[PDB]
Amino acid sequence: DTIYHAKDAVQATKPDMRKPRLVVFVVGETARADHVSFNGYERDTFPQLAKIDGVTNFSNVTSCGTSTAYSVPCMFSYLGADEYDVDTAKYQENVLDTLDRLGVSILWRDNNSDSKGVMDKLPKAQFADYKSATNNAICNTNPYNECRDVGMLVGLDDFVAANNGKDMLIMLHQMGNHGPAYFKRYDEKFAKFTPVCEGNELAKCEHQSLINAYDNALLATDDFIAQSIQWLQTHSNAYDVSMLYVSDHGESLGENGVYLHGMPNAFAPKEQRSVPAFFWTDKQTGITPMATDTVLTHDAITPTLLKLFDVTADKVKDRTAFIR
Amino acid sequence: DTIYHAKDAVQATKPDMRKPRLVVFVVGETARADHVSFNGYERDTFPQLAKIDGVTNFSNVTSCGTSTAYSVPCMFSYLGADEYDVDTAKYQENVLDTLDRLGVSILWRDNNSDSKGVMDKLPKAQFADYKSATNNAICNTNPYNECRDVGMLVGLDDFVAANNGKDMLIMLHQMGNHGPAYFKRYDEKFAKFTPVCEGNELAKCEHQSLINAYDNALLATDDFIAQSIQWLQTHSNAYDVSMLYVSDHGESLGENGVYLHGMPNAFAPKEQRSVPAFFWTDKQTGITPMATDTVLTHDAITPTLLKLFDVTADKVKDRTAFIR
Ligand SMILES: OC[C@@H](O)[C@@H](O)[C@H](O)[C@@H](O)CO
Ligand SMILES: OC[C@@H](O)[C@@H](O)[C@H](O)[C@@H](O)CO
Ligand SMILES: [Zn+2]
Ligand SMILES: [Zn+2]
Ligand SMILES: [Zn+2]
Ligand SMILES: [Zn+2]
Ligand SMILES: [Zn+2]
Ligand SMILES: [Zn+2]
Ligand SMILES: [Zn+2]
Ligand SMILES: [Zn+2]
Ligand SMILES: [Zn+2]
Ligand SMILES: [Zn+2]
Ligand SMILES: [Zn+2]
Ligand SMILES: [Zn+2]
Ligand SMILES: [Zn+2]
Ligand SMILES: [Zn+2]
Ligand SMILES: [Zn+2]
Ligand SMILES: [Zn+2]
Ligand SMILES: [Zn+2]
Ligand SMILES: [Zn+2]
Ligand SMILES: [Zn+2]
Ligand SMILES: [Zn+2]
Secondary structure, three states, X not given: OOEOOOOOOEEOOOOOOOOOEEEEEEEEOOOOHHHOHHHOOOOOOOHHHHOOOOEEEEOOEEOOOOOHHHHHHHHOOOOHHHHOOHHHXXXXXXXXXXXXXXXXXXXXXXXXOOOOOOXXXXXHHHEEEOOOOOOOOOOOOXXXXXXXXXHHHOOHHHHHHHOOOOOEEEEEEOOOOOOOOHHHOOOHHHOOOOOOOOOOOHHHOOHHHHHHHHHHHHHHHHHHHHHHHHHHHOOOOOOEEEEEEEEOOOOEEOHHHOEEOOOOOOOOOHHHOXXXXXXXXXXXXXXXXXXXOOOEEHHHHHHHHHXXXXXXXXXXXXXXXXXX | OOEOOOOOXXXXXXXXXXXXXXXXXXXXXXXXHHHOHHHOOOOOOOHHHHOOOOEEXXXXXXXXXXXXXXXXXXXXXXXXXXXXXXXXXXXXXXXXHHHHHOOOEEEEEEOOOOOOOOOOOOOHHHEEEOOOOOOOOOOOOOOOOXXXXXXXXXXXXXXXXXXXXXXXXXXXXXXXXXXXXXXHOOOHHHOOXXXXXOOOOHHHOOHHHXXXXXXXXXXXXXHHHHHHHHHHHOOXXXXXXXXXXXXXOOOEEOHHHOEEOOOOOOOOOHHHOEOXXXXXXXXXXXXXXXXXXXXXXXXXXXXXXXXXXXXXXXXXXXXXXXXX
């Protein structure tokens, strides 16, 4: 019952005749553009990414919607935000379907929830649940026994070896800044801003303590993205490596009494849709980022992923991406 | 070849058993929300509407697009901005088709261009060109021989008499703030802000002189809307009278070197889509406006027009309008 959108897609060069390409796409969670240092926030919430050459920050990115179930399938859609509908997304060919058909090896590790239908047509072995300590080795580093996003990097070299010489796209779906318990989202080495709200009744938190917990969780995501780049750099001789980060949606933090996310796009405050995006690539790859102030949305993700693998598809041929 | 959307529409009460309803919808042109006094502009650009009881200003209205051809059909569409497509709008049943089928008498006078397909299924006599001095009696009041929006009010009592006792919806498509020659858009009694730019090469205008011409054209629209209300008030004993105003799109005035409108929504600056909207009703009508800060778009127009005539249609049943 698949409705196709890119049966014409062609890959202009193959990994038997040029370097294979290895990309990590971090599918972020709950992060707000306006809490990113690079976008003008008053605090340095991304100190480690600031030191990495080759990172581009995008200051004007709007998510497709305000929730995981709405945004995540739209991020991988061909249809764009206007014609995307959540009710039928599962039956559309999505960009991972196309890349898999073209021979890219797809992996999805999830420390959040699940792929919201995006992985459903691909073999079940290509999806792995990293919220569970059965699979994630990094869960006892905090009082909540919460498995951490950095645990998704453990053992990726085995996936690379099993796909030796092929193009690869790895999605890491992070827990990130999920609320309401922002204080649970980061280990103690990131407990920089204090005091913190440590209750789930957010309207009873002092506003600054809630912001402080949220910003500490951002520091842990800065760390996770930095470690994902460092992992890619261990493969940059054999593979052309790049990393894309985009959050699924933002978050309200008490403005006008609004908390969490999920508001319909018709009425949602801007904080629920203004999201960070970062793109990193190694110097060898020939990939050129777009200008930092390009007006961008989740609709740029599908053409970016196709372009990273040298794929053209008529449906998105002239659509703006995060890269040229 | 009509694609229907509201074949279920029903009118809950008819003008043989309650007062007939008479509405003017001013389809505006090029006006920016941020140049409206009520929205926080630094100048009083709407002094006459300020004095009329029963006017509601809406501070958060976003147009469907940035041009006449895109926005005008969307304003009367059932589909909403996301699923609206300009290429097939002409074949969809629109809200005027539904209201005409239900017995509302539709009139469209145009001092701008045309209805962009919206009137095309209705008899040609229901559309009248008021850009021409053959039909518009008010064109020699300025050095440009430009026919004025207030000329569209002349002789409306004859339309009311020919439709005596029926519900009526009159669209007045104004020239408004059309550029680039903003200085041509208003007669001398509105030449309040000076000096003015009087050239069509906008980037050579001093910025303040360009703003001054634009704001003088707003004063003439304040006057035209006030006179449209005053006209309605001459019929408020026999008819339940109301007036809706919404602009088709905004305008760039030199911000970052951008002038005029028409930018694709993907990249358009906010000034091209943030538009004023006003709603007036007489005290007798029982119509209640929404809160001034309701998040609104052109998608609110179709349910507003249906609600004004006591019509329900499943497709827009729970869609937010400018009124309850
Ligand atoms: O515009 C839809 C919005 O982005 C989305 O968050 C929904 O409100 C939510 O998915 C409903 O559960
Ligand atoms: O998003 C479309 C935009 O609103 C519209 O103004 C078009 O750019 C124009 O109609 C093209 O001519
Ligand atoms: Zn710092
Ligand atoms: Zn989320
Ligand atoms: Zn969740
Ligand atoms: Zn949830
Ligand atoms: Zn949709
Ligand atoms: Zn739909
Ligand atoms: Zn729908
Ligand atoms: Zn649907
Ligand atoms: Zn494969
Ligand atoms: Zn410590
Ligand atoms: Zn005044
Ligand atoms: Zn226009
Ligand atoms: Zn025009
Ligand atoms: Zn034009
Ligand atoms: Zn469309
Ligand atoms: Zn379309
Ligand atoms: Zn289209
Ligand atoms: Zn089309
Ligand atoms: Zn009729
Ligand atoms: Zn004078």
